[PDB]
Structure formats: C-alpha cells, structure tokens
Amino acid sequence: SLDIQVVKRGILEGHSDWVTSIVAGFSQKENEDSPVLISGSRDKTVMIWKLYEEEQNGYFGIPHKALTGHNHFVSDLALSQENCFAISSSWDKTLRLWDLRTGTTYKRFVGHQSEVYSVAFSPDNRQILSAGAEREIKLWNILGECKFSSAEKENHSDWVSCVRYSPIMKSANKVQPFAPYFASVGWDGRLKVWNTNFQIRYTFKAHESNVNHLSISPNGKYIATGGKDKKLLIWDILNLTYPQREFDAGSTINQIAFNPKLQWVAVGTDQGVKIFNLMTQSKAPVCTIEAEPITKAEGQKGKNPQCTSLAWNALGKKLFAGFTDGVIRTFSFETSAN
RNA sequence: CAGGUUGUACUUCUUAGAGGGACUAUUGUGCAAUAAGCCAAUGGAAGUUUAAGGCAAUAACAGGUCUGUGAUGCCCCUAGACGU
Ligand SMILES: [Mg+2]
Ligand SMILES: [Mg+2]
Ligand SMILES: [Mg+2]
Ligand SMILES: [Mg+2]
Hints:
1 chains, mainly beta, four-stranded antiparallel β-sheet, 28 strands, binds magnesium ion, Receptor of activated kinase C 1A, component of 40S small ribosomal subunit, ribosome binding, WD repeat
C-alpha cells in the first residue's frame, strides 16, 4: 500500500495561555538535526525547550529556560542563523533579542506604537523587520535603531499579520529570475512582495477575509497564504494573475509552513492540522485534529482546542503544533505501511 | 554581623507617571423558545455590577437654620440702647 499514518511522539506542557509562536533550530551542519526548540505564548513568555531522546513517558521534552519579558502577548518569534539569538514580537509595543543560553535580552527595540504581530529576521542578521496593527513594517538595526518604516503609498489597509524574507540560495550562481525579497500579508487580505529596498514589487488582493499567515517555500519560489478565507492559496513568484494551487482546509487557517524538504504544506486550522501535497492533485493527504490533553480534566472538556502554530524540525521529520490549551504536540510521519 | 565609601551600575523592595489587566473569560447543568440571564467548576492580584466611597431624578416634608454670612422683607431697640 504505502500510506501516511501520523504517529504521535510526545507533548510539551508548560505554557499558560495560547502558543502563538514556534521555531526549531537551524542545521548548523548540513543535514544534522538541531536539538533546539523555541516557542512563544500569550502568557507573555518565550520558551526554550530541552528536547528529549526517544521519549514517550507521556512527554517529548521539558522546559529548560523561560523568558520573563514583554508586558503583554508574544505574537511571533524569529530565530537567528545560529541557535543562540532570537527576537519576539509583542502587543506590549516592543520586540526582544534573546541570547539563547542566558535568559537575558540584551536589546529591546522600542518604537512601535500599536501591538506587534510579526518579527522578520534577515538572512544577513542585521535587518530586523516588524509588522503590527500600525499597518507599518519597521526596519531595525541589530542594535535597536528603528531605521525605516513602510510608507503610506506602500503599506496596506487594516493591520499586518505576518512578514517574512525569501531565503537565500547559497551557491553564487545567477540564482532565480526573482531577487530575494520579503512579502507581507495584511488583514485587508492583500499579499505584497517587497523589493529589499522597501519598494513595492507585487501587491495582489489575495483573499476576502483577513489573512492570518503566509509562508515561503525554502526555494523562495512559492508562497502559501490563508485566513478566515478558510482557503489556502499558494502563489508562484512568477505568473501571479492566479495562485499556483488552491486547497480548502476545514475552518480558518492560522499558520502555514512547508516542509524543510519533503514538499508538503502543513496548515494550522481551528480543527487541527491538515497536511497537503503539491506532488499530487489530491486535497488532504493527511489530517489530525487530535486535541484533548487538558481535556481529560474529569468533567472539564474543551472539545477541540485550535492550533496556533506549526513548525518542523531541521530535517523535516518531526512536526510541532501549539494549541489553545498551551500545549505543543509532536507528530512524526511513517509511510510504506500496509 | 554590623559601619563607611564608590560607581554617568541597577531596579525586586520605595516613589509615581505612561500603559497594561475583567469583559463576567473557558467548560458543563437550570433557564431556555431564540433570550436576558442564574449556578458550579478551572484559570486568575482580582469575579457579591471585584471592594469601599463621591456624585445623586420628578415632587415634597408649611423639616432645619434670619445666632455663619456686608443674603435680605417686615417688626423690634436707639445713648442710664437688644450698639459697642
Ligand atoms: Mg459601587
Ligand atoms: Mg437631594
Ligand atoms: Mg441663614
Ligand atoms: Mg448697656
């Protein structure tokens, strides 16, 4: 037969409120798994986890360092090239630089006016991008000097939900026809692509509902977009008079993240997470909603806690999902079964 | 363990200014017509509209004060005056 059966691995308990952000370490050495996991909750704290080995006691890992910080919620986490630095966006109107090995923040960027909904880290870790309710994207020095702010002509209606930078092809070839950039998605349901120097490259009205998230394929070839639109739209950085592929995932979409290799898209919905495949033309290759850990509280039953974040580990084997109840679940993928 | 210093060092304690924060939130019975809402549990600094107060409608009590008033009507006293 050869089919995808999603075997569970473990759970990470420690977060008070929603788990709004998750990031796993990068491959410090070609194809080596990273033992570093970072999460961000509404509880106002950032989390550095001590990953476990072959665990199944019930958990998969344990809390190593908790970051006392922001005065409010944590909207997103951007991780530095090497697993030792990280930024966090908050509604408190600030951002933070955590030296991941010392629960300290050596730099707080204060300048934002409204809450912040996303932190973008630049390949050449010297450019820090932040999007928030202000409808502005700010550019920061690895110091804290807010440098530039997305003008009016350029910013978009409603607030910004997420901003990312297209990755970077290593070999100094003549790369793709496109040049690295950074796209932003706003609640006005518009996806915009920016020419490094904050100049409009592409602004297409994406959905009708607000867009809660977007993701760029490591290729820096396509972008996945979704929101209350309840539909996931994927775009080709070239012909963009229409989405390179469109799927319908049950309920609203909160997080979309391609596999660091494999070539599937994991979508975070209120149900659970639906994984699709661009290889085929199917419509729901895999699907898990399994959410009920706190739910076993004799009498207290929060049916389906919606997931708030998705993140695979370096290789593309493990998969993490932060949920309502503030609990991260671990899912591995085994095929060739039956 | 007390004492003296010193540092363009720090704020947990103290001060006070900005801003957070609860809204009845999440879960299940009663209500249930849909309801407004009521209950219990959990989380919570905080759930009796959080606690304690301020403000206080229309009428009216012929309530009380002319001894608080240079607010006054009328009536009283006026130089052996109730003036001083
Ligand atoms: Mg009161
Ligand atoms: Mg009165
Ligand atoms: Mg009087
Ligand atoms: Mg006399």
